[PDB]
Symmetry: none
Subunit: 121 residues, 4 copies
């Protein structure tokens, strides 16, 4: 199981919350074209935003960053990413520590796990 | 084009642990005990521990809010005996509003950060 | 593949009228009066009358539940004077649960059939 | 404005309600491929189901019936259609009275209307 999970946390000014949520549907449409993306969901604690992103492997996360780059530049003025976590097995995170350094990610290496045959992450 | 519909009932809990270095290996050993206990819960879909050095984390995925409540009851005794190895510094709960409404009362003692899931894409054969 | 997200706030009201034949042409004339009055409501997106012989119908589309309540206030006086031309035999209200919750109290006197909108596809440029 | 609106009403046994709602997502996926379908939404009054279907013209409704026929036969045992209304201008409903007779439709001819430039139905 090489699945990796990325989690950006967003600080959204209250005047930008509705525009941010409208863009979420655009990010979801664009990300839905990625074969390696298994899950992409936006959740909110008031003005604190969050995305739970599941990719089939490290390459999937790298594909997503390239795929989403143009949308990122369009919407980058609506919020600040205040934290970025990447969770997965060490052998996949090893492929990401170099490429992702610009995000200052917090890397969590998955070491012990239970899961049902239906649910990979 | 726009697609709209109800979210899955799935809820995810994420405690973040501050583990003293002198307790880190004992904490990791106990993780096997917590996994074994949780693996018998019908409502638990995923339960896994990850580490950023001495920062620990558990990703807990339940089929609905009731699954998370069942876990709280199941693990209460174990939580109280491994209590001393770490402290929980953040506790997040993610899920749809209607399920999180069932959790705000029972989990108040954890002072959780509740994130209401509002928009999602998924491949349902592999992730809920 | 599965897409999930919130419904539009749009609400639709549909009264069905039983119109005596002797009143049908007068009813149709008054429809112009009701359309003119309703056309000044900011919250009204669509308001149209259709007929299956002497069975009349209005399709009323509002941007949210508040729009429907504003219409009730706006039309109250007109409703009371054209009151005698027909009877309402069915009154349906369609929309998302959170908006319909705002209507169950104010519209109780109409004994409405409330249909909660749960899944939808749409082309947002032309239909809400 | 040639738009027509179709409205099936469903009586769903309580034991079939969840399966019916799961099929709704399949009907929505299939109907989303129709260029002439502008809106397709399912609503529920307990066990009473309803679809609000908006088509750009009478041909769109006929295309939908053909497009959805295979799914109809798969799911036809989950509920009964107890009423079927078709609303639109007379000139479009004239094209449907023959083809749709098997549904025993209730035809409502739209005669007077207000709408904002953004909303066709």
């Amino acid at each position: 199981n090489r699945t990796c999970m990325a989690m950006p946390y967003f600080e959204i000014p209250e005047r930008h919350l509705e525009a941010f949520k409208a863009y979420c549907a655009v990010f979801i449409e664009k990300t839905s074209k990625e074969p390696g993306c298994l899950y992409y969901g936006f959740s909110f604690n008031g003005t604190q935003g969050h995305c739970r992103e599941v990719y089939s492997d490290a390459q999937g996360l790298l594909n997503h960053l390239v795929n989403i780059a143009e949308l990122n530049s369009e919407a980058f003025h609506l919020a600040s990413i205040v934290r970025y976590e990447v969770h997965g097995p060490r052998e996949e995170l090893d492929k990401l520590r170099g490429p992702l350094a610009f995000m200052k990610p917090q890397f969590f290496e998955l070491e012990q796990c239970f899961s049902r045959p239906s649910v990979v992450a």
